[PDB]
Design a protein around this ligand. Structure first.
Ligand SMILES: Nc1ncnc2c1ncn2[C@@H]1O[C@H](COP(=O)(O)OP(=O)(O)O)[C@@H](O)[C@H]1O
Ligand SMILES: [Mg+2]
Lengths: 159, 145, 810
């Protein structure tokens, strides 16, 4: 719709990658929508996806391209995308003292038990691809984690 | 990728040369007959006279290159091909599992059909249930059993 | 929320950082979780299942039932942050369902003490608690109220503090029904200051040692077993402690009110007489029984045995020995002491004189009794009996003799008993005040008050109205105090606002009672024309006020029980129906002025006792003293300890919701809450407020550089909140009711979405990383997938296979 020629271009660039693995044919499976956006750089929550076009199971229905554009458009618009400010406000609500540190388990539970919960996998993967270490008292700097998490996995230009 | 290549051509050049030494005249069947003779097996007629007319006028060299091109438009360099297979193994030895590779060429990518996935086994380096990738590569151009 | 949340001592004050993280963490849904009405705990928790107009179908919390309360009995509930709330006033949602809840929850954890704004609630543990150890004192010393957990000692202390810093007076007002333990806290409060303040300077006390022993000696005479409390305070007390600048104790003075004169000679079925007769006839002091001429057996004495003779928890032998000690400590002579016993005894022997009559002429029978009676009062037998049987009144122009019939000569021996006690009480108070008066400079005082709250019953006579009138005042002194302080506060924060002194409210009830010609006033008249009839007394009353002063009306009825009521004095608490039942007799003290005059000769206490130096109307004296109090009380910083009785059966941890929720509605606890509400009952301190709702709207500006009031204001404007709902002051932001409720809501509903968002940036990191890999692996694959296909089309090309073996051919 009101998207650009570049963006559209940018969307295909990724769509087709997605098409290529369910077998090139020009259609992608709705459960994919979630992940297809995270690669066009965004960070929806499942709730945001569901409501937007996402489905929760792989045989539910496949979208075309001219079908994702609007799903993309309508979503590059919400702006509560989540800021470095909000995350940091939230973790204070767990920072027992004020020293910025936070018990290793606890961060691992918040992430695993609350909000839109995460697998003992994703939960351990990320602590790994972000080298987040404990410290003698076994706690974690939530800022170290936040910076990295939002940096990306490929920060400067390569990995 | 596609329509040309240096070494490749020259090889079709020298290739086209072991054929007329059986005479510098582009002495064809006379030597089509005679070039198979120094190799190891005997050929019928009708082929000698159809093998040749897959080309119209004459299998001169330039033309000897045309029947060959329409047939080699993708024969992407070697390592560009040995590495591809490497991407889906990262086990280390030299293999892709039957089970894997099968989903692979058959479901994902520009999907392989049953007829092709079949043929793909007839000649396939699939002994014991794994798959030596450094061979369909070697069986790229050709090398061994 | 207070100093070493894990101090062994705080076992009954606060929870543990662990235990409170639990109450605060239990689930919630401001759409599903609520408060509902119930038959046995008044209210209970609920989760709404269905809704259809009013037929709201709720499954309760514990039970698992599904009642179907109409909509309005669906109370709103406070969120988890508030579970165990230490001060009842911070509840965003104000309601009984809550107030009751905040209370037993706290109560059933071992927490008796508990604040609610200006008031500090108490609830009778009914069991020794360690709450009052000295070491706890220190811990509680010096601290503002919020630095420590709810506890008498803070209120005692902050009082003391403000005494010093404000160089003004301190009054502490302990209230509540009967047996709700106000006499228990009192001597704590008093025992407190005795340590905190004590000074640095044979058988006698110490000004502080002595301030304390007042209780024994007073209670051995003021208290007596009652159905509601085995140690019932049969009277009011205002003790006052004077401090000399330096802030130490300089002495104290005592005030007593409404001594129940009636048990002297009368005791209900279950009940008992002033603990002292029982302590006397106790084995403790042998000779003593001899000296008061008596015999070891509280059974033989008509004035004692009409109910019990022992209380479930009392060792009368000890008490005495204790009581006999508070005497020595208070510095009384062996002789002064004897004197205070023999009188106590004469009250025994009195009820043991028997009479017989021969035509309106009663006559002794066993002079034997009066003979003793005579040896105590130090007069003489014959002379005593005479004044008793035949008296010389004085009919205006003449002194006549007269004949008294047995009923008379009897009723008479009562008054003389009820008068000799009262006198004796007073002298006893009078005699302590005498030792507690050191005469050392006195800058200020803190004065404590133990006194019934409104006594509203099924049958209501005089003695009823007295007390009810009393708190009728005390209730507006409060309503006053509040008005002031609430207005002052809204100034300190500079929040524009208009109020109204509700003491004005109680001004009718109070006038009608005390004005020049209302109840008590008229009662003085009647009380004065011998030809006085109770029927007489309602004619004057009915007449004057009848349907002419609203606060005066037609009394409601029983069935054929209790008895006939006459005028209903609508009060604060509620409204009472009163009995004319012989107030005239009750009011004015009778007594053969003949006997009086014969007493004014004898043995000392007798002397001081009847030696005067026309108005004994138990009332004149009460209005007299009642004031002497209000002048004192309006000259002080008032402090309120609201005592509460948990349940009838004298039992530890147990809430008769019905009863408790009753007191809450005639204490004033539900009134502050009712009043605050049409105000901004929720007052949040800027810092605190920053540390909790910034998350709703935040930003980049480090916290230490942000200004509280600015945040709050940004945080609300964004959220869209009606300006009606808050008032931002210089130090707090004032909120209407639902605000801290909604904020809490909008918050957890935020923190949730925030963490989802993080976990969404995490589901984005990770997905982005393999996107690398699947980008590469697609090149690998289209390679394979394009050569292996190219090949299939060559493995069978005759030219091809040829080229192949003819290749190595070089
Ligand atoms: N906090 C407490 N600690 C120990 N005992 C208490 C406490 N509160 C009340 N009691 C007991 O409860 C009963 C009621 O006592 P009391 O203070 O005299 O009530 P009230 O003064 O209201 O008539 C007494 O027998 C007393 O021993
Ligand atoms: Mg009391």
């Amino acid at each position: 719709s009101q998207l650009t020629k570049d963006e559209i271009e940018e969307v295909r660039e990724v769509f087709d990658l997605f098409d290529f693995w369910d077998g090139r044919d020009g259609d992608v499976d709705a459960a994919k929508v979630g992940d297809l956006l995270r690669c066009l750089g965004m960070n929806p929550t499942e709730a945001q996806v569901h409501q937007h076009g996402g489905t929760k199971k792989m045989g539910e229905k496949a979208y075309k391209l001219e079908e994702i554009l609007p799903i993309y458009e309508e979503m590059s618009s919400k702006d509560t995308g989540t800021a470095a400010d909000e995350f940091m406000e939230a973790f204070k609500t767990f920072d027992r003292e004020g020293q910025g540190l936070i018990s290793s388990a606890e961060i691992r539970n918040v992430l695993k038990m609350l909000g839109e919960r995460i697998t003992e996998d994703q939960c351990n993967d990320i602590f790994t691809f972000c080298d987040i270490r404990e410290d003698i008292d076994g706690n974690i700097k939530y800022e170290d984690l936040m910076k990295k998490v939002m940096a990306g996995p490929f920060p400067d230009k390569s990995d | 990728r596609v329509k040309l290549s240096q070494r490749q051509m020259q090889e079709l050049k020298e290739a086209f040369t072991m054929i007329d030494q059986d005479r510098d005249g582009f002495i064809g069947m006379e030597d089509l007959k005679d070039m198979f003779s120094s190799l190891g097996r005997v050929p019928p007629d009708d082929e000698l006279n159809a093998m040749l007319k897959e080309c119209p006028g004459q299998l001169n060299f330039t033309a000897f290159l045309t029947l060959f091109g329409e047939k080699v438009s993708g024969t992407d360099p070697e390592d560009a091909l040995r590495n591809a297979f490497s991407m889906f193994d990262e086990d280390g030895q030299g293999f892709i599992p039957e089970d894997y590779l099968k989903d692979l060429l058959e479901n994902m990518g520009d999907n392989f059909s049953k007829e092709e996935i079949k043929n793909v086994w007839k000649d396939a380096p699939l002994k014991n249930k794994q798959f030596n990738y450094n061979k369909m590569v070697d069986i790229k151009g050709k090398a061994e059993d | 929320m207070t100093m070493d949340f894990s101090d062994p001592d705080m076992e009954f004050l606060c929870l543990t950082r662990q235990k409170l993280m639990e109450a605060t963490s239990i689930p919630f849904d401001g759409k599903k979780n609520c408060w509902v009405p119930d038959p046995d705990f008044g209210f209970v928790g609920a989760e709404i299942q269905s809704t259809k107009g009013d037929e709201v179908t709720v499954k309760t919390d514990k039970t698992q039932e599904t009642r179907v309360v109409k909509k309005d009995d669906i109370g709103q509930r406070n969120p988890p942050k508030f579970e165990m709330n230490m001060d009842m006033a911070n509840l965003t949602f104000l309601n009984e369902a809550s107030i009751l809840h905040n209370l037993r929850s706290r109560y059933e954890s071992g927490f008796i003490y508990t604040y609610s704004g200006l008031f500090c609630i108490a609830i009778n543990p009914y069991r020794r608690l360690p709450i009052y150890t000295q070491g706890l004192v220190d811990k509680y010393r010096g601290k503002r109220r919020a630095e420590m957990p709810p506890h008498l000692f803070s209120i005692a202390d902050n009082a003391y503090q403000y005494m010093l810093q404000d160089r003004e007076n301190q009054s502490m007002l302990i209230t509540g029904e009967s047996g709700a333990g106000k006499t228990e806290n009192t001597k704590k409060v008093i025992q407190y200051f005795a340590l905190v303040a004590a000074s640095l300077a044979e058988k006698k006390g110490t000004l502080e040692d002595q301030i304390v022993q007042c209780n024994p000696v007073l209670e051995a005479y003021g208290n007596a077993k009652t159905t509601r409390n085995n140690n019932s305070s049969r009277f009011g007390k205002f003790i006052r402690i004077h401090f000399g600048t330096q802030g130490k104790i300089a002495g104290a003075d005592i005030e007593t009110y409404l001594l129940e004169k009636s048990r002297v000679t009368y005791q209900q079925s279950a009940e008992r007489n002033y603990h002292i007769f029982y302590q006397l006839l106790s084995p403790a002091f042998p000779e003593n029984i001899e000296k008061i001429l008596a015999v070891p057996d509280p059974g033989l004495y008509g004035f004692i045995n009409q109910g019990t003779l022992t209380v479930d928890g009392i060792d009368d032998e000890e008490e005495m020995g204790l009581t006999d000690t508070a005497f020595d400590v208070l510095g009384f002579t062996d002789e002064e002491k004897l004197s205070m016993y023999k009188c106590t005894g004469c009250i025994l022997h009195l009820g043991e004189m028997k009479w017989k009559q021969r035509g309106e002429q009663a006559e002794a029978d066993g002079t034997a009794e009066a003979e003793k009676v005579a040896f105590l009062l130090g007069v003489n037998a014959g002379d005593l009996l005479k004044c008793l049987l035949k008296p010389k009144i004085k009919v205006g122009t003449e002194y006549v003799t007269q004949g008294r019939n047995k009923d008379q000569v009897t009723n008479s021996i009562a008054a003389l008993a009820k008068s000799l006690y009262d006198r004796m009480f007073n002298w006893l108070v009078r005699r302590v005040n005498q030792t507690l008066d050191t005469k050392a400079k006195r800058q200020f005082f803190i004065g404590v008050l133990d006194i019934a709250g409104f006594e509203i019953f099924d049958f209501n006579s005089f003695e009823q109205l007295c007390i009810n009138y009393t708190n009728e005042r005390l209730q507006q002194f409060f309503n006053h105090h509040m008005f002031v302080l609430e207005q002052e506060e809204y100034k300190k924060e500079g929040i524009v606002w208009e109020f109204i002194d509700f003491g004005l409210d109680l001004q009718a009830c109070i006038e009608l009672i005390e004005k020049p010609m209302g109840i008590l006033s008229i009662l003085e008249e009647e009380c004065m024309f011998p030809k006085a009839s109770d029927t007489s007394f309602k004619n004057k009353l009915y007449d004057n006020h009848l349907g002419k002063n609203p606060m005066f009306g037609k009394p409601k009825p029983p069935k054929a029980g209790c008895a006939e009521a006459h005028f209903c004095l609508h009060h604060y608490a509620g409204s009472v129906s009163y009995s004319i039942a012989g107030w005239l007799d009750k009011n004015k003290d009778p007594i053969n002025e003949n006997v009086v005059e014969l007493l004014q000769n004898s043995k000392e206490p007798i002397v001081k006792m009847l030696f005067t130096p026309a108005f004994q109307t138990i009332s004149s004296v009460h209005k007299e003293s009642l004031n002497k109090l209000m002048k004192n009380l309006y000259s002080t910083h008032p402090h309120f300890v609201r005592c509460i009785i948990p349940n009838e059966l004298k039992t530890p941890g147990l809430i008769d919701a019905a009863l408790v929720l009753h007191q809450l509605r005639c204490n004033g606890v539900l009134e502050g809450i009712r009043i605050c509400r049409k105000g901004f009952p929720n007052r949040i301190i800027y810092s605190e407020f920053k540390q909790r709702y910034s998350i709703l709207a935040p930003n980049a500006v480090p916290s230490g550089f942000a200004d509280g009031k600015v945040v709050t204001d940004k945080a609300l404007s964004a959220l869209q909140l009606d300006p009606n709902e808050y008032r931002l002051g210089n130090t707090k932001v004032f909120f209407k009711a639902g605000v801290l409720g909604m904020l809490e809501d909008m918050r957890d509903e935020r923190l949730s979405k925030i963490i989802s968002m993080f976990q969404a940036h995490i589901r984005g990191y990770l997905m982005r990383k393999a996107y690398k890999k699947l980008q590469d692996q697609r090149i690998g694959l289209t390679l394979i997938q394009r050569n292996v296909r190219k090949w299939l089309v060559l493995r069978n090309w005759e030219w091809w296979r040829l080229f192949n073996k003819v290749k190595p051919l070089l």
